[PDB]
Amino acid sequence: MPTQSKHASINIGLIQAREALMTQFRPILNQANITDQQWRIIRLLAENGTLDFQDLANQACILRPSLTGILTRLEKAGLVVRLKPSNDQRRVFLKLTAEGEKLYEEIGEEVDERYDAIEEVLGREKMLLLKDLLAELAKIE
Amino acid sequence: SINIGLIQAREALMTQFRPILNQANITDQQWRIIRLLAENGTLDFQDLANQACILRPSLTGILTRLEKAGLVVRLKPRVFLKLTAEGEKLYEEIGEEVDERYDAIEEVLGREKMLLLKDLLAELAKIEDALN
Ligand SMILES: O=C(O)Cc1ccc(O)cc1
């Protein structure tokens, strides 16, 4: 065995943590016919109201051409609508439709159950702390 | 959303470490595997798959290339995996630059916050098992 690095990999910790959430969320998403990437988008559009294409890619962490393809499909499905701003000719905003909002709620409630279970166990204070630290690490640069 | 927060925090780390891994001509997945092997000493294929969060056929491909590069050895003739001498060496020289970038990050957020995050992730993982 070599000498361990000074810092443990926060990266691997982040990856294992999200993957443990996904095994709990995978059957929920499968039944609603929604992928992991699709739900990141759906939950972000619901919670932010709207995001422009560029901000949506950064926050959902999806490569840009792949996001376009996903968006195209979500629009054809009637879940996502494009919003154009009167002060920028190229910039595109995205928002859930009525159908998209309803889908968010019915999936959102199922998903939130595990978040609630963890929160009743870990405590609201710690839960907030974890969310705030992730956001502080994420907003670096 | 802890889910979304987790992936955003990860994407932010990636940007900090990308230049280090690319200069070494190593991918995130390859580095992930090298670290897990280095830090566990020896692992079976399945355990490696689970800890790296990589599906088995995709892992086989990555392992195939790490072996051809002389960094990883399969134990032959359930399959076990181990780093070579060179793989260990690579872990140390890349690992040092990686620790350096972590020191810089820790200076931005603060050591206490970094430790808090590590502690909460560890507590999160132990809640997940308990609930199940
Ligand atoms: O945790 C590490 O080992 C550093 C690292 C972080 C993110 C990434 O994508 C690659 C390496």
Residue numbers in the entry:
A (entry chain A): 1 to 141
B (entry chain B): 9 to 85, 91 to 145
What did the publication describing this PDB structure actually write?
NadR belongs to the MarR (Multiple Antibiotic Resistance Regulator) family, a group of ligand-responsive transcriptional regulators ubiquitous in bacteria and archaea. NadR binds the nadA promoter and represses gene transcription. In the presence of 4-hydroxyphenylacetate (4-HPA), a catabolite present in human saliva both under physiological conditions and during bacterial infection, the binding of NadR to the nadA promoter is attenuated and nadA expression is induced. Each NadR monomer consists of six α-helices and two short β-strands, with helices α1, α5, and α6 forming the dimer interface.
First, we crystallized NadR (a selenomethionine-labelled derivative) in the presence of a 200-fold molar excess of 4-HPA. The NadR/4-HPA structure revealed the ligand-binding site nestled between the dimerization and DNA-binding domains. Unexpectedly, only one monomer of the holo-NadR homodimer contained 4-HPA in the binding pocket, whereas the corresponding pocket of the other monomer was unoccupied by ligand, despite the large excess of 4-HPA used in the crystallization conditions. Inspection of the protein-ligand interaction network revealed no bonds from NadR backbone groups to the ligand, but several key side chain mediated hydrogen (H)-bonds and ionic interactions, most notably between the carboxylate group of 4-HPA and Ser9 of chain A (SerA9), and chain B residues TrpB39, ArgB43 and TyrB115. At the other ‘end’ of the ligand, the 4-hydroxyl group was proximal to AspB36, with which it may establish an H-bond (see bond distances in Table 3). In addition to the H-bonds involving the carboxylate and hydroxyl groups of 4-HPA, binding of the phenyl moiety appeared to be stabilized by several van der Waals’ contacts, particularly those involving the hydrophobic side chain atoms of LeuB21, MetB22, PheB25, LeuB29 and ValB111. Specifically, upon analysis with the CASTp software, the pocket in chain B containing the 4-HPA exhibited a total volume of approximately 370 Å3, while the pocket in chain A was occupied by these three side chains that adopted ‘inward’ positions and thereby divided the space into a few much smaller pockets, each with volume < 50 Å3, evidently rendering chain A unfavorable for ligand binding. Taken together, these observations suggest that Arg43 is a major determinant of ligand binding, and that its ‘inward’ position inhibits the binding of 4-HPA to the empty pocket of holo-NadR. Specifically, in addition to the different inter-helical translational distances, the α4 helices in the holo-NadR homodimer were also reoriented, resulting in movement of α4 out of the major groove, by up to 8Å, and presumably preventing efficient DNA binding in the presence of 4-HPA. Subsequently, upon ligand binding, holo-NadR adopts a structure less suited for DNA-binding and this conformation is selected and stabilized by a network of protein-ligand interactions and concomitant rearrangements at the NadR holo dimer interface.
